């Protein structure tokens, strides 16, 4: 739920 809502990430 990173950015965007995705696994450990920040795209």
- This structure was determined by NMR
CA distance 1 to 11: 11
Show the tokens assigned to 3: 């950015």
Query: What radius of gyration do the chain's Cα atoms show?
Result: 5
SS3 assignment for 1-11: CCCCCCCCCCC
Region class of 5: left (phi > 0), else alpha (psi between -120 and 50), else beta: beta
CA distance 4 to 7: 9
DSSP label of 5: S
């Amino acid at each position: 739920s990173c950015c965007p809502w995705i696994i450990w990430c920040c795209l």
